[PDB]
């Protein structure tokens, strides 16, 4: 029980990634575009006040949200806004929740969430009561990634079913070290890995250096998002710059990247990018 | 080979160890998401301690029992008398014994100070004895589904998982290799059995003026024994003979020491992978 | 997807090249374990061929047939003439291509000098055509089960392996790493696709005053093409335009060349593992 | 069909490597001694004359055997000695076959084995015409691994069913260069790998430098043989020199090694011994 | 080539750099052992500035005067305009370039955004104007034992040190190293000149979340200009056109910067040597 | 001026290391015995109470003092005491002098010096007031080097020849990472260089893992001193444990060294042990 | 005495080299351009038939020789041609001589010097009989570097104060593994050094892998010279192939490389180019 459903990805996986990128809308198009490359400025996304998660109980303080991109089938990204005395109480959610602070402080259960905290909570996995701290808003990238539609329902113990595994309650990226990039064109640049699927894809923090040019186009064979947390990257005649977001779904031909200051960029992709040509580069005469 | 346990962290019970759920000696119950640091010299050594199903007129020996689940499965600090002597035999559950003082010999092989050995379930092994003239004291680690107990048999049980069977590992002799936690990368190990899932034992070297820097969120079972040296660990120092036991989910305080140490580890979950030991750091 | 046969040295199938049990454009039949090596400059260029399936009217190329398979698998040089324009549609087997000279356009993406591409069977294809006003020289790999037939269709055909859709990969732009074998340590390795049982297809750069010293017995299927450069194998010497086909278990003489040179290779096994490229040197 | 009866490994494996070392008698040992280490001289091994693979036509030279170890399933180590004319045609063997040419020179085939070269003959495939080289006399290291005892049987192509992704037709140690030894205790020697099982076990020679010295026992919960080729090595009071042989089956505890002038020594283990606890150094006070 | 003053900490003077003793725009003599920073904006922009020895209708420049000494060595931003147009010839000092913004023409080469030259004295250039028709700001650096002039010359000195003539160096084609010191193990380095004593000149770029942990004693000179970002040291935030001076044995603060940043720095001692950068963590 | 008389070393140095451990008179010894390891309780040694710098003014207070060794020279090492409320005036010493933190806390100038930190000021170079810290004694190993015995002078700024390139003014081993160590026998050991000399000699501290055994008994030619800080190490049938000191001057013959705890140990060697044929391993018959 | 007048190179160097690269007039320039690549087809430089080494007996068979670069101190490069039948005396020469051989095979003394062969004669070191091998001409780099102009002396032995250590007889560049590039613009390029300098310039061969792209301009504060044997390399819009050459003298700006095929170049330069800001990439808006 509990865990059904899990849909395909887009360029060919078996699903067991459980984030579901493929075929999603964004918040700037009418419909899925496949193939294209999607890039957005999240503050002008409009700020839909007087959320809350389905099932919460009515009396809850209210967040807000901007959809960046979602699916029919439930799955999405969203930059949410909890208040000040924002306080829910314990329970699970019947889908797998990413968290990734971006402004301010939250606490899940024990656990304190400050700037650019994450975490991974599965399907089924129980939370403590969870607040905002410090007395002023928190700003969170809100990922629900399950196959149905995420719902609160509150519960004393885990689902039975619930892959506790995988639960990652909270992941300081700031104490975290930097390490080697996996692919072969961001050389000049570092990689944070927070988590990795069974298939070998993955959420981390990408660090690009000053002076940088990846120098070619790339035909990127999977489902990619990401937001901009600071600095800046020039791809085509875009830049990109703090609370930017993107989305490319499989088989986009991202333009060239530049950046003379560098930056900081949460990213998520549904594939495993260390395997022979899954970044292929790309410069036609 | 019949009811192996799931683990609290959700691993699929292969690992055979059972650390998931388990009551202190300083503990009315499971305390989970706690950390429990205590002096096993100051545990109730309760004398008279033989192992169920071996002949009576064996001479007993004592025990200090650390922690233990209803199953069965538990962890002990016993001291064997100067003349025991045991028959040959095999155990209903896995066995783990780690020699803190004096020596033993299991069959034909001697198990001196910081020996070790693995037997699985259902493996034969032949008479065995203190060694010395003087008391031998072990980490009497008892693992099965079911409680432990010796049973006569000639030969091996069709069924024993025998290629997991270490008869007599000398950690001294091992060489320290590298560590695999990001955070004790100021420390060496020495791996003395790992699981099919990766989880293991293993002897942690903390060299001299360690700090992790920050706490630890451990999303797995762990428990271990202090051999030599000092560890603090928040306001509490574990020194020569104080053992822990941390549930999965814990938030391990910072670590710190200036002399440095030798500890007896053991966790059921393979460490290597993202997202394993978080180090946590809150402010206010 | 239907009917892969398994690998003459014992493979599962799963690789789907069917390189194994090949007739070359020199040979009446398939000869076992002979390498074969010939200049494609001689071969025959058949005027007037089209792909089964594709419309009529649609401006015809020619082919030069290398190597070919019963079951319909083959290799051939093929070129498309200046205005040649084709539609959209799927092939009804995999189909791998590598352009020689001129530039292609594959829906989207250019294929310009030495770019690549792998069509699994059933992935949808945009409309294509030649570049340039020029003619384009193209490796043309027909691998399915089926003979290679075109057949118009506005989406991908539900059971199409996508995840193995490589659209477009210049090589010219991808770095060089270091080459596999032990045997050819002397010369770099760019790897174009890997099978899911790590047969592939690459390039390779032999450095100058490259000597391999003694023969190989190759148990494997390889073919290859020579872009630049030469390498003399026994008293034969490969230049630029020259193809290759060695069946499994062939015994391929020294390789010698003080110049090097850049080579198209394709191979069905994995070669990493221990005794799949054995150094022979028989004395008298 | 062909493909039968592979018994599982005396220290616990699950006998895909079908190699069936485990319980054997030795030549100098009336019945299999478990846990007992073995050394003993092959030249003071009785070599029965009129020697004949099973199956073979009976016009064909015979060739003489000293059988080393022996399990009564079939499966066998021998030092076989093949006279100047001998030629045998070409067919299958019902079991796997090893050879690996100690002295003189063999032809399998169309591929010549000289001086340390090897070959893995699995079961049903097919060989060509085979026969002694040059008009002298060659030695070989003759094992027979099958679960049936091994037979020749006429056939013009291969088995049906044969394992023919294991058939190393021929590889010449010499031309083979040395590379890093796998245990902690040979940390000062060097290793040729020339055959991995799928459960990580296999065939190697180990060179072992000058000055050598592991310092304890070792208990060794695996099965392993091994041929003394060129060298010594003393192993507690016992000295194994050129032509000497030994048999270790699953959980012997071996003397302590030592050499002033090293040498070359053909091995074969049924398990991998990279894992962790696989080769445990002893030494008892 | 005469004059070249010793080095505060203890160096034999080879390295011409001069940053020895110097003044801060922000303070009225030099303070011994004491770091100071400050925003370059804020620093007064005397108007007019011309080199000595110039012709008198050649275009002037500003100059913002960061810290110098009463030798003549000296660090500054100077900014010249659209038009400006020089003549061939020589300097009397060593005179580094560091472009901030904007681009210039020393003699046949383009210095665009952080291009770098050094400048031996007594080598010549040739003609120099600005480029695009935009002002360029400049870290004009003037190291010589003697203030800098300019002087007409259609040949280099014959004892001018030619071997250490950087011409130009674009900065952003430069791939980015390894970092020298244990304590900035997270951040790269790009290494623009080298002493004959091992001190010289760098871009260092600071990945986010950094933290040092400890305050660091720095038995040598430094300074630096910060390009991009941000770094926090005590309770000072180092940003855009912010500059520092740490003469020998200064005790720089802890270093923070969750964004990270890009940093211009100049150093006159070797940092490789045991014992060079001293983390110092006091209690109390 | 200032630096004059640098003696050369006794294995054949050129004395640019200034340290002066040749030919040193022991605690525990009535001459200088060469080529005689020699080990001591530092606790047992004499503690000559009333002890002050040579030229400082007499109304500073007094410490005491553990004279370790010495030559008539004037260089030594000795385990000095300083009272609570201890405080110097500022200016320099005619001679090297390092400090090492044993117990509790002292104050050079402006840096603090607490547990196990350390200092090298060389000759010339001045110092400011300096203090005890923290209302309890420190304990430290102070050690006189030059060619004239230490002698206090006051004085505003640096002497004009001073070497105040090697001027380590405060050290806190504690926050310094451990690294490889240099000898072939302690591979199982780490090492934490403190300074290194123009001729490669150096201070280190060195912690010795548990489970130790050099196995062999070593030739040192040169000249080494130390102070077990922690834990012990059996060498011979000797056990240094915490406050014990060593001499071992050129030629020593060091028994086999042995520690089932392991330990941490400040040691100070006057040869670059890098060099083939430095750290010779000896085992007679 | 011999050794005398080195002068001091272009760029800044020292003059240890003894290469005088510095200055050179090409065959394609009426005098030295400075700061100037040139690039030229050896085939089109004209061939002066009969030359002979001054001091030679007149006799000896006469050669032809394709002066490439010179200086009028002496210092030069050229192509020259032996005939089939030439034989030449044992003796010495006045001034450093460096050889290549481009085709045919050459003796010099006991040794042959075949194809891509090279062999370094410093001045006074005594060569013994040198002839022209298999029956056909061979071609040669013939290079000339001392300060007085080279002639050849018969002498018994070698000159007193000849450079000895720096001979190197005979080396078979084929036979020489391939090893990393230098320079960080190369890194997709091989090295074989033939010969370093005690300043650190050299001689060596560069292989240029196939797919080559430098992406920028080389500012070059050294001196280079280099001949094309095999392959291609577009260097700007000039196309060096098989028998072209090149000399760059201090403080060139180098166009940008590319070549699809890859190619083989002897290459000689006179400074490190280990060192910071010894290649600097250049690229122009």
């Given at each position: 029980?509990?865990?059904?459903?899990?849909?395909?990805e887009?360029?060919?996986g078996?699903?067991?990634?459980?984030?579901?990128?493929?075929?999603?809308?964004?918040?700037?198009?009418?419909?899925?575009?496949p193939?294209?490359?999607?890039?957005?400025?999240?503050?002008?996304?409009?700020?839909?006040?007087?959320?809350?998660?389905?099932?919460?109980?009515?009396?809850?303080a209210?967040?807000?949200?901007?959809?960046?991109?979602?699916?029919?089938?439930?799955?999405?990204?969203?930059?949410?806004?909890?208040p000040?005395?924002?306080?829910?109480?314990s329970?699970?959610?019947?889908?797998?929740?990413?968290?990734?602070?971006?402004?301010?402080?939250?606490?899940?259960?024990?656990?304190?969430?400050?700037?650019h905290?994450?975490?991974?909570?599965?399907?089924?996995?129980?939370?403590?009561?969870?607040?905002?701290?410090?007395?002023?808003?928190?700003?969170?990238?809100?990922?629900?990634n399950?196959s149905?539609?995420?719902?609160?329902?509150?519960?004393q113990?885990?689902h039975?079913?619930?892959?506790?595994?995988?639960?990652?309650?909270?992941l300081?990226?700031?104490?975290?070290p930097?390490g080697?990039?996996?692919?072969?064109?961001?050389?000049?640049?570092?990689?944070?890995?927070?988590?990795?699927d069974?298939?070998?894809g993955?959420?981390?923090?990408?660090?690009?250096?000053?002076?940088?040019?990846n120098?070619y186009?790339?035909?990127?064979?999977?489902?990619?998002?990401?937001?901009?947390?600071?600095?800046?990257?020039?791809?085509?005649?875009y830049?990109?710059?703090?609370?930017?977001?993107?989305?490319?779904?499989?088989f986009?031909?991202?333009?060239?990247?530049?950046?003379?200051?560098?930056g900081?960029?949460?990213?998520?992709?549904?594939?495993?990018?260390?395997?022979?040509?899954?970044?292929?580069?790309?410069?036609?005469?």
């Amino acid at each position: 029980f509990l865990h059904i459903a899990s849909v395909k990805e887009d360029w060919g996986g078996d699903g067991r990634g459980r984030m579901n990128l493929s075929g999603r809308r964004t918040a700037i198009a009418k419909e899925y575009l496949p193939r294209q490359y999607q890039f957005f400025d999240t503050n002008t996304v409009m700020e839909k006040q007087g959320w809350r998660v389905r099932g919460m109980p009515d009396n809850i303080a209210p967040g807000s949200r901007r959809l960046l991109t979602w699916h029919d089938s439930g799955a999405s990204t969203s930059r949410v806004v909890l208040p000040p005395k924002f306080e829910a109480p314990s329970g699970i959610f019947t889908a797998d929740l990413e968290i990734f602070v971006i402004k301010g402080a939250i606490q899940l259960g024990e656990w304190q969430l400050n700037k650019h905290s994450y975490s991974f909570i599965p399907a089924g996995v129980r939370i403590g009561s969870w607040k905002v701290l410090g007395g002023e808003e928190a700003e969170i990238l809100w990922m629900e990634n399950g196959s149905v539609p995420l719902e609160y329902k509150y519960a004393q113990e885990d689902h039975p079913d619930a892959r506790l595994s995988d639960f990652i309650p909270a992941l300081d990226s700031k104490l975290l070290p930097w390490g080697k990039a996996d692919t072969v064109q961001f050389v000049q640049a570092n990689k944070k890995w927070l988590r990795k699927d069974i298939n070998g894809g993955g959420v981390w923090l990408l660090a690009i250096l000053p002076h940088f040019d990846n120098k070619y186009q790339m035909i990127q064979p999977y489902n990619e998002e990401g937001y901009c947390l600071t600095g800046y990257c020039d791809v085509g005649d875009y830049r990109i710059v703090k609370d930017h977001y993107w989305y490319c779904p499989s088989f986009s031909t991202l333009p060239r990247h530049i950046t003379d200051d560098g930056g900081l960029f949460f990213v998520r992709v549904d594939r495993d990018l260390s395997k022979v040509a899954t970044v292929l580069s790309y410069a036609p005469q």
